[PDB]
Structure formats: structure tokens, C-alpha cells
Amino acid sequence: AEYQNIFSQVQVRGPADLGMTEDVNLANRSGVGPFSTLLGWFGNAQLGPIYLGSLGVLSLFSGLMWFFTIGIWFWYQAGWNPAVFLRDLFFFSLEPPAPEYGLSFAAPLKEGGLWLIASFFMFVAVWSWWGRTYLRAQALGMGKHTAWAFLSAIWLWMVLGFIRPILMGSWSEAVPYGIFSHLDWTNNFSLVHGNLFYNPFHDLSIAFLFGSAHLFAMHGATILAVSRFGGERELEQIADRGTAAERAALFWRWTMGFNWTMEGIHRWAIWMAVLVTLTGGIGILLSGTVVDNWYVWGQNH
Amino acid sequence: DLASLAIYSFWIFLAGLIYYLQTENMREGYPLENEDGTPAANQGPFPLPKPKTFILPHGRGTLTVPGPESEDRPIALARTAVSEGFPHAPTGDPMKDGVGPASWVARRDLPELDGHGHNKIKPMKAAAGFHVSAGKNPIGLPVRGCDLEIAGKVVDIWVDIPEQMARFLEVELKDGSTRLLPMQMVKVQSNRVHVNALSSDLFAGIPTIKSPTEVTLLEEDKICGYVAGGLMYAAPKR
Amino acid sequence: ALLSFERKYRVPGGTLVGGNLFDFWVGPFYVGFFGVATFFFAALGIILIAWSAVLQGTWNPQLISVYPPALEYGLGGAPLAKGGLWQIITICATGAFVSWALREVEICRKLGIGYHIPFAFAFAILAYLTLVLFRPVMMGAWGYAFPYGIWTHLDWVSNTGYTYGNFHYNPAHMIAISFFYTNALALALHGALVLSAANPEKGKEMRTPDHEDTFFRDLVGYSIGTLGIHRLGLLLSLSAVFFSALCMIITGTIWFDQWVDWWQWWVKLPWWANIPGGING
Numbered sequence: 132a133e134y135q136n137i138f139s140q141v142q143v144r145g146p147a148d149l150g151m152t153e154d155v156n157l158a159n160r161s162g163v164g165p166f167s168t169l170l171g172w173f174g175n176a177q178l179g180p181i182y183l184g185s186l187g188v189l190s191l192f193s194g195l196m197w198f199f200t201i202g203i204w205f206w207y208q209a210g211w212n213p214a215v216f217l218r219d220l221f222f223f224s225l226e227p228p229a230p231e232y233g234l235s236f237a238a239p240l241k242e243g244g245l246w247l248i249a250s251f252f253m254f255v256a257v258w259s260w261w262g263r264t265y266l267r268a269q270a271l272g273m274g275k276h277t278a279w280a281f282l283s284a285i286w287l288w289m290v291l292g293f294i295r296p297i298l299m300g301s302w303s304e305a306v307p308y309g310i311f312s313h314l315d316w317t318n319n320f321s322l323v324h325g326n327l328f329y330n331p332f333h334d335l336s337i338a339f340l341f342g343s344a345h346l347f348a349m350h351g352a353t354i355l356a357v358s359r360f361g362g363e364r365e366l367e368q369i370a371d372r373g374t375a376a377e378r379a380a381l382f383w384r385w386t387m388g389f390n391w392t393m394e395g396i397h398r399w400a401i402w403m404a405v406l407v408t409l410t411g412g413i414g415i416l417l418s419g420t421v422v423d424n425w426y427v428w429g430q431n432h
Numbered sequence: 433d434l435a436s437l438a439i440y441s442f443w444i445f446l447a448g449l450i451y452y453l454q455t456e457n458m459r460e461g462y463p464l465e466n467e468d469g470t471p472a473a474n475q476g477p478f479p480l481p482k483p484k485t486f487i488l489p490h491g492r493g494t495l496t497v498p499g500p501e502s503e504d505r506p507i508a509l510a511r512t513a514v515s516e517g518f519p520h521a522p523t524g525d526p527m528k529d530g531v532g533p534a535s536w537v538a539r540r541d542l543p544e545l546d547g548h549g550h551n552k553i554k555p556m557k558a559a560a561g562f563h564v565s566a567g568k569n570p571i572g573l574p575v576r577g578c579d580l581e582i583a584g585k586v587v588d589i590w591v592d593i594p595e596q597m598a599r600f601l602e603v604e605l606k607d608g609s610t611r612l613l614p615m616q617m618v619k620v621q622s623n624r625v626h627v628n629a630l631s632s633d634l635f636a637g638i639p640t641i642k643s644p645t646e647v648t649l650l651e652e653d654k655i656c657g658y659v660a661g662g663l664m665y666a667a668p669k670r
Numbered sequence: 671a672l673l674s675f676e677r678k679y680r681v682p683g684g685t686l687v688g689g690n691l692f693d694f695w696v697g698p699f700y701v702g703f704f705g706v707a708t709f710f711f712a713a714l715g716i717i718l719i720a721w722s723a724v725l726q727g728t729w730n731p732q733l734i735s736v737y738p739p740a741l742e743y744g745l746g747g748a749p750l751a752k753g754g755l756w757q758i759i760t761i762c763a764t765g766a767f768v769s770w771a772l773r774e775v776e777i778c779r780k781l782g783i784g785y786h787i788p789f790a791f792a793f794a795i796l797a798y799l800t801l802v803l804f805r806p807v808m809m810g811a812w813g814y815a816f817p818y819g820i821w822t823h824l825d826w827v828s829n830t831g832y833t834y835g836n837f838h839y840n841p842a843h844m845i846a847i848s849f850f851y852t853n854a855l856a857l858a859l860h861g862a863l864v865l866s867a868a869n870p871e872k873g874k875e876m877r878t879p880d881h882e883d884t885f886f887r888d889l890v891g892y893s894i895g896t897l898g899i900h901r902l903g904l905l906l907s908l909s910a911v912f913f914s915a916l917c918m919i920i921t922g923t924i925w926f927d928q929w930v931d932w933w934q935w936w937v938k939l940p941w942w943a944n945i946p947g948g949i950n951g
């Protein structure tokens with residue numbers, strides 16, 4: 132008999148929202164997309180519009196090329212048989228060059244060259260997309276927090292497939308493109324380095340990953356709990372504290388004696404998440420380059 | 433050893449980050465006070481952070497925090513014990529005096545504005561193009577209180593224009609006047625809208641808005657605070 | 671001490687047990703009946719751990735470890751120094767966590783807010799009880815539970831996992847990991863979005879939620895919205911923990927072989943099982 136505000140009871144709709152203009156080149160915005168009543172029960176029903184300038188186009192082109200380069204290799208391994216493609220879809224894998232080739236680009240297409248090509252497309256797609264997170268915020272006069280947080284995820288990605296392989300001396304150290312294969316690579320990486328549970332950066336990384344679910348469950352629940360006081364209108368609660376923000380602060384002060392403000396909790400949010408891939412990248416980078424066996428390392432230092 | 437230096441350095445960084453986070457979360461509510469409103473002796477281990485200033489749009493000024501704090505409203509409560517740490521009993525009607533779970537903050541007495549400077553929330557009849565797009569349309573349904581008696585009828589939905597969502601239900605009472613009910617506090621059913629937080633006889637007491645086509649931040653707080661306070665104080669009639 | 675706006679909320683009422691008996695605060699902390707219960711369970715538990723440490727022969731936080739009864743004890747009780755203490759401490763922990771949840775409910779009632787927080791915390795508790803209660807009882811012995819030690823419990827994780835090969839192949843574990851990754855992604859984005867609007871480029875005015883929707887729509891062609899993002903974070907968060915619990919409640923019970931081999935049912939499907947070529951042919 133008491134609504135919980137998890138799903139909406141009634142949806143309302145008005146003219147398609149084309150968004151704020153600011154310094155955005157409207158010529159690069161698409162038209163609005165379809166409205167989804169299904170999505171409207173949980174969140175917004177409106178799809179689009181999206182902004183696609185030159186950089187965006189470049190990013191989607193590389194992204195797709197990356198995906199298709201791997202897909203072509205898969206069909207090949209499947210002997211071009213549709214039934215085999217689906218059957219072993221998770222077993223197919225585009226692997227990097229063998230150690231023998233070091234960091235060169237001389238490896239044959241079916242023996243590393245194709246992995247390098249795919250990786251080149253991924254490199255361009257990811258970094259150009261990073262440019263988008265920065266520029267889309269700049270055009271709207273917004274802070275660059277999103278581009279900075281994204282850079283943290285990019286750090287772990289860069290370390291795994293580019294920076295560490297280079298410091299190790301060969302592309303063979305990089306991660307392969309495959310569902311089961313990248314899992315196998317992950318398990319093997321830990322085995323070869325003496326168990327990552329002995330890598331302090333790995334364990335901190337875990338504390339932050341768990342911490343992120345801990346914090347978002349806390350935050351999501353808190354805001355919904357005070358949504359009856361307009362709590363989710365966070366920007367205005369920051370600019371003019373309401374009873375929603377006061378009750379949220381007191382809930383946590385009375386429960387665990389925490390200091391809490393509407394803006395401050397979002398600083399806990401961005402950092403808790405960002406630290407996952409930040410501590411993680413350092414942990415991976417140090418593996419093999421400076422520390423061969425974390426267990427052995429832990430016994431000394 | 434580079435690994436030792438890195439992890440050692442990281443813990444230092446981490447200690448600084450936690451210090452920063454703790455102080456950032458002190459921009460509202462500090463300095464701490466005694467139950468009588470005076471500055472408390474123990475202000476905690478962290479000092480207040482240097483003030484920061486937010487520039488508010490639409491010429492509404494700025495906000496600087498931390499800054500001088502004051503309720504800017506009367507608080508109808510009184511001590512129930514001779515020492516700190518105990519409850520403070522309402523001196524009158526808590527629902528009417530706005531204390532306890534029925535509290536409200538003295539927010540700006542102006543409406544929240546969207547990115548274009550227009551009122552963010554408007555009754556649907558006054559919002560061009562807006563209409564119900566899914567679910568049971570509550571407009572026209574009778575409103576029932578926790579005492580299982582009908583208190584009024586839904587005459588409109590107040591929507592958030594920029595975010596296209598229902599925020600309040602406008603309810604007409606027997607005397608012809610209307611009141612706003614938080615969308616998060618009503619249950620829309622097939623033949624009625626049920627309100628568990630209030631008994632029929634408490635609807636007339638819901639704070640009213642000065643202008644019929646807009647609601648200020650101050651008014652929203654008084655309305656939302658009042659309705660929520662019914663869960664505890666209307667209990668006898670539930 | 672109290673926050674500058676705190677007094678108006680410190681009224682009587684909301685308790686679930688004891689009336690006004692325990693309706694008071696200690697510094698910033700609210701007490702209530704379950705505040706006392708929490709203290710009781712927590713105190714007794716910590717004391718029993720200190721005792722266990724004495725019987726273990728160490729006071730080092732990095733070494734203190736309380737292990738559950740050996741498998742030979744089944745689901746029966748065991749001597750205190752041989753699993754018994756673990757059993758009592760587990761009862762205390764459960765009591766403390768549950769009491770903490772109910773204390774949150776009392777706080778919710780006094781503040782007039784929804785019960786989402788304690789409801790969400792219950793999922794964490796259920797994940798805990800899955801590891802020390804439901805799974806062990808299903809497998810037939812307390813010994814299958816993890817020990818209470820900072821480092822020893824990681825040994826349990828590693829040993830329990832490899833007991834089934836590379837645990838990565840547990841399908842429910844794959845779903846759980848996905849929710850954890852997606853959650854961190856959304857937490858990073860949510861924090862970054864709100865902050866980028868409240869702290870714009872130097873000298874500019876604060877942005878509006880209108881700008882938040884616009885930014886994300888320009889970026890990916892969609893915005894779940896101000897209310898949606900908090901609903902999403904709660905959903906991703908709890909779903910992650912729900913599938914974690916599910917991935918373990920089925921391990922050692924309905925499936926106890928190597929998880930990698932479970933995936934063979936798809937490869938062995940009649941219509942393509944024998945077609946030459948590929949990886950499995």
C-alpha cells in the first residue's frame with residue numbers, strides 16, 4: 132500500500148527535448164529517436180538525439196573496424212560454417228604475435244599481424260572517443276570530470292595491451308580477443324606472477340570495486356528514500372539545501388557518524404570508482420616489469 | 433624497490449584524499465552546535481575547508497559554503513531531559529509547526545528554473561504538448577486517506593518539463609480549493625488514488641501555494657514535509 | 671554536538687521496541703533498542719575473537735584467524751577452541767548485522783523517509799549468510815564456511831575457487847562480475863556528471879539537470895535521467911550481490927565438477943555437435 136518509487140506509476144510526455152544549445156554546433160546533432168514506453172517505467176523514454184561530428188564518425192568507424200577484424204578471424208577459424216560459428220563462438224580467439232617477434236610488426240597476418248591491426252583500430256576508437264567526452268562537455272561549458280574519470284579506465288586498458296607489453300619487450304604479453312580466451316589469460320597472468328592476492332594494488336583495487344557497489348547501493352537507496360522530498364534534484368539541493376538533503380545527512384550521521392553533503396557524496400562516488408582502475412593499472416604495470424612473484428615480494432617488503 | 437615506493441606513496445596519497453573528502457563533506461551544517469544553538473566545544477578532528485562559491489544562473493546570485501548557518505525559522509520544540517542527547521518534544525502541533533518528520537527548510541521562496549529560465553514544474557494543463565503517455569491516468573479519480581475516507585479528487589498532474597515526469601497530483605477538496613500531493617506519496621489504483629500518510633481530515637492542513645500555476649522551493653518543502661510527517665503523526669487515524 | 675539544522679529532527683518516536691526507553695543519542699549516534707542489541711552482539715563477538723586470539727597465541731591483526739569446525743564435525747557443535755568460537759561469533763555477527771538493519775529502520779521512521787537503505791543492506795547480509803549458513807548447511811558441514819582472518823579468508827577464496835578449476839567459468843559468477851563492472855562504470859559516470867554540472871568551467875554559472883541530459887545524449891544518444899540513475903545504481907548494486915550469492919549457493923550443491931565443463935552442453939547440441947572444423951571439431 133506504499134509506493135517505493137522503483138518503477139513509475141504514470142508516464143507523461145511532451146515535445147521531444149532537443150537539449151541545451153550553449154556552444155554546441157547544432158548542425159552535428161541528429162534528430163530525436165523513438166520513444167520507449169518500456170524504458171519509461173524505469174528511466175527516460177526518449178531516445179536521441181545524438182551528437183556526431185568528425186571525431187565521433189572516426190570513433191565509430193574504428194570501433195566497428197576493430198569488431199569486424201575480429202569477426203573475420205572468427206569466421207575463418209569456423210571454416211566459414213555458420214553452424215560452427217555459433218557453436219564455438221566463445222572459443223574463437225584473435226591472439227597477439229608470438230614472443231619471437233618481440234615488438235616488431237613483421238609477424239604474419241594469421242600469426243599476430245591481424246591482432247595488431249585490430250588493436251590499432253581499437254586504439255584510435257578509444258582515444259578519439261575520449262576526445263568526445265572532453266569536447267562534448269566543453270561545448271556545454273561543463274567541467275571535465277567525465278573525461279578525467281574515463282582516463283582512469285583508459286589507464287588500465289592502456290597498461291594491459293600497450294604499455295606493459297612494450298616494457299616487457301613483446302606483443303605476446305598483451306590480451307587476446309576472445310570470450311573464454313581473455314578469461315584464460317587472466318587466470319594465467321595471476322598464476323605466472325605468484326597469485327595476485329599478494330599484489331597490494333590488486334587487493335586495493337578489489338576494495339574499491341566492492342566499495343563502489345557498497346557506495347552506490349547506499350547512495351541509490353538514500354536518494355530514493357528522500358525522493359518524496361525531491362531528493363534526486365541534486366543540483367538544486369546543492370545550491371539551496373532542502374529537507375531532502377538534511378534528512379539524508381542525518382540518516383548517515385545518526386547511523387555511522389558520517390559527515391555528508393549532497394555534493395560531497397558525489398566526490399566519494401567519483402573517487403571510489405576511479406580508484407578501481409587507477410590502483411589496478413599500477414598493479415598490473417608493476418607485474419613482470421618490477422615484480423616477478425608477488426608472493427616472494429610480499430615475504431620481503 | 434619501486435613496488436615498495438609506489439605502494440608507500442599511494443597510502444600517503446590516500447590519507448590526503450580521505451582528509452579532502454571528509455572536509456568537503458563539512459560545507460553544510462558546520463560549525464557544530466549545542467542543543468541551544470550556540471557553538472559546540474568539540475568541532476571534530478577536521479578544520480573547516482576554505483569557502484567555495486557557486487554562481488547561480490538566472491541572476492539569482494551565488495552560494496558560498498561553508499558560511500553562517502541559521503534556520504531562519506521558529507522551531508517549536510522543548511527539551512525533555514536535563515542533559516544532552518535526548519529527544520525534544522513538540523510544543524504544539526508538530527504537523528502544523530513543521531518539526532520532526534514534518535520538518536521543512538527555509539529554501540528560496542522562488543520556483544526552480546529550467547535551463548531556459550522557465551519554471552521547471554507546471555500543472556499539466558498549462559504545459560504545451562504534455563499529456564499522460566502510459567499507465568492509469570489519475571486525473572478525475574477520488575482520493576482516499578488512511579482513514580479510508582475520500583478527501584478530494586485529482587484535478588491535474590504537475591509535471592517536470594525538462595525531465596518530463598510527474599512530480600505532484602493536484603487534489604481538489606470539498607471547499608473547492610486544491611492542494612498538491614507528492615507523487616512519491618500516493619498509490620494510483622484503478623478506481624482511486626490512495627494516500628497512506630494522511631487521514632482525510634488532514635488534507636485541509638496541507639500548506640497551500642500562493643500562486644495557482646507555480647510552486648516555490650519553499651512551498652515544496654512545506655508540502656513534502658507535511659505529508660511525510662503524517663506517517664508518524666497521523667498514525668492514530670491510520 | 672548537532673549539525674546547525676539538526677535539532678528540529680531530534681523528536682521522540684519511531685522506535686520498534688521499548689517505546690521511549692532507548693530513544694536517545696550518544697554524540698552523533700542514535701541508539702534505540704537495536705542500537706543496544708547491536709552493541710551487545712558486537713561486544714560479545716569482539717570479546718570472543720580476543721579470546722580466540724589468546725588461544726591462537728597471537729595479538730597481530732594480520733595473523734588472528736578464527737576457523738569454523740573441521741568437516742568431520744558436520745553440522746554439529748564443536749569444542750570452542752576447535753570451531754565452537756567460530757560458531758558463536760557467527761551468531762553474534764548475524765545478530766549485529768540484523769540489529770544494525772532494524773536500527774536503520776527505526777532511524778527511517780523518526781526521519782520520515784523510505785526504507786530503501788536497510789532493504790538494500792539486507793542483500794549484503796544475505797550474501798554473508800549464504801557463505802556461512804545456507805551453503806554450509808546445504809553441503810552438510812560448517813567447515814565449508816570461510817574463516818575470520820584478514821589474510822586467511824583470501825586463502826579460502828582462492829582454494830574454494832580452484833576446487834572447481836578456473837572459477838571464471840561459473841555462469842552465475844560471470845553475470846555477477848558484469849554487474850559489478852557496470853556498477854563502477856555508472857558510479858564513475860554519475861559522480862562525474864553531477865560534479866561537472868555543479869563545478870563548470872571557471873567563471874560560469876552552475877549547469878542544470880537539463881545540461882546533464884544534453885551531455886549524455888550528445889555523447890551516447892540517451893539519458894536515463896535524474897531519478898533513473900539512482901534507480902539504476904541500486905539495481906546494478908543489488909543484482910551484483912544477488913548473483914554473487916546465487917553463484918555460490920549452486921557451487922558444491924547442484925554443480926560440483928569443473929565449471930569449464932558445464933559449457934559443453936551447448937557444443938554438444940545434436941544439430942552441430944559433429945560438424946567438422948572450428949575449435950571443437
Ligand code: BCL
Nearest residue numbers: 333334335337338339341342345716798816820821823827
Ligand atoms: C566478498 C567475497 C569474499 C571476500 C573476498 C575478498 C577479497 C578477494 C578481498 C577482500 C578484501 C577485504 N575483505 Mg573480504 N571477503 C568476503 C567477506 C568479507 C566480510 C564479511 C563479514 O562477509 C568482511 C568483513 C570482509 C572484509 C574485508 C576487508 C578486510 C578487505 C577490504 C574490504 C572492502 O573495502 O570492502 C568493501 C567495503 C567497504 C569500502 C566499506 C568499508 C568496510 C571495511 C573497511 C571494514 C573491514 C572490517 C575488517 C577490518 C574486519 C572487522 C573485524 C573487527 C573484529 C570488528 N570480507 C567473502 C568471503 N575480500 C580485500 C583485502 O584486501 O583483503 C585483505 C581483498 O583483496
Ligand code: BCL
Nearest residue numbers: 341344345348715763766770790791793794818819820911
Ligand atoms: C548489497 C550491496 C553492497 C553493500 C550495501 C550496503 C548498505 C546499503 C549498507 C551497508 C552497510 C555496511 N556495509 Mg556494505 N555493501 C556491500 C559490501 C560490503 C562489504 C564487502 C566485503 O564487500 C563490506 C565489508 C561492507 C561493510 C559494510 C559496513 C561498513 C556497514 C555495516 C555495519 C554493521 O553491520 O555494523 C554492525 C556490526 C558491527 C559494528 C561489528 C560486529 C563484529 C563482530 C560481531 C565480528 C564479526 C566479524 C567477522 C564476521 C568478519 C571478520 C573477518 C573479515 C573477513 C576479515 N559492505 C555490498 C556489495 N552496505 C550499512 C552501512 O551503515 O553502511 C555505512 C548499510 O546501510
Ligand code: BCL
Nearest residue numbers: 284285288317318320321327333336337340411412414415
Ligand atoms: C584467477 C584470477 C585471478 C585474478 C586476476 C586478475 C587480473 C589479471 C587482473 C585482475 C584485475 C582485477 N581483479 Mg582480480 N584476480 C582474481 C581474483 C579476483 C577477485 C576474487 C573475489 O577472487 C576479485 C573481486 C577480483 C577483482 C579484480 C578487479 C578489482 C580488477 C579489475 C577492475 C576492473 O574494473 O576491470 C575492468 C575494467 C577494464 C578492463 C577497463 C576497460 C576500459 C575501456 C577502455 C574499455 C574499452 C571498451 C570498448 C572498446 C569495448 C566496446 C564494447 C561496446 C560497448 C559494445 N579479482 C584471481 C586472484 N585480476 C585487473 C587488475 O587491475 O589487476 C590489478 C587485472 O588486470
Ligand code: BCL
Nearest residue numbers: 288291306310313317838843844845847848849851852855
Ligand atoms: C580485469 C581483468 C580482465 C578481464 C576479466 C574479466 C572477467 C573475470 C569477466 C569479464 C567479463 C567481461 N569482459 Mg573482461 N576482462 C578484461 C578486460 C576486458 C576488456 C578490455 C577492453 O580491456 C573488455 C572489452 C572486456 C569485456 C568483457 C565482457 C565480455 C564481459 C562483460 C564485461 C562488462 O559487463 O563490462 C561493463 C560494461 C558494459 C556492460 C557496457 C556494455 C558492453 C558489453 C556488451 C561488453 C562488451 C562485450 C564485447 C567485448 C564482445 C561480445 C560479443 C560476442 C559476439 C558475444 N574485458 C581484463 C583483461 N572480464 C565477464 C564475462 O561474462 O566474461 C564472459 C567476466 O566474468
Ligand code: BCL
Nearest residue numbers: 794795797798827828830831836837838846847914915918
Ligand atoms: C581464485 C579465486 C577465483 C574466484 C573465486 C570466488 C569465490 C570462492 C567466491 C568469489 C566471489 C566473488 N567473486 Mg570470484 N573468483 C575469481 C575471480 C574473480 C574476479 C576476477 C577479475 O578475476 C572478479 C571480479 C570476481 C568477483 C566475484 C564477485 C562476483 C564475488 C565477491 C563479491 C561478493 O560476493 O559480495 C557479497 C558481499 C559480502 C559477502 C559482504 C557482506 C558484509 C556485511 C553483511 C557486513 C560486514 C561488516 C563488518 C564486519 C564491518 C566492520 C565494523 C565497522 C565497519 C567498524 N571474482 C577467481 C577465478 N569468487 C564470492 C561470492 O560470490 O560470494 C557470495 C566467493 O565466495
Ligand SMILES: COC(C)(C)C/C=C/C(C)=C/C=C/C(C)=C/C=C/C(C)=C\C=C\C=C(C)\C=C\C=C(/C)CC/C=C(\C)CCC=C(C)C
Nearest residue numbers: 201202203250251254288289291292293306308309310313
Ligand atoms: C556476425 O559477423 C560479423 C563478422 C559481421 C561480426 C562479428 C564479430 C564478432 C563475433 C566479434 C567478437 C569480438 C570479441 C569476442 C571481442 C572481445 C574482446 C575482449 C574480450 C577483450 C579485450 C581486452 C582488451 C585489451 C586489454 C586491449 C588492449 C588494446 C590496446 C591497448 C591497443 C594497443 C595498440 C596496439 C597494440 C597497436 C599499435 C599502435 C601504434 C600507435 C603503433
Ligand SMILES: CCCCCCCCCCCC[N+](C)(C)[O-]
Nearest residue numbers: 331332334335338339342402403
Ligand atoms: C576513497 C575510498 C576509501 C575506502 C577504501 C578501503 C580500504 C580497505 C583496506 C584493505 C586493503 C589492504 N591491502 C594493502 C593489503 O591491500
Ligand SMILES: CCCCCCCCCCCC[N+](C)(C)[O-]
Nearest residue numbers: 745746747757760761764802803
Ligand atoms: C537466521 C538464522 C541465524 C543463525 C546463524 C548461525 C550459524 C552457526 C550456528 C552453529 C550451531 C551449532 N549447533 C549445531 C550446536 O547448533
Ligand SMILES: [Cl-]
Nearest residue numbers: 349350353396
Ligand atoms: Cl548517499
Ligand SMILES: [Fe+2]
Nearest residue numbers: 354365860864
Ligand atoms: Fe546522486
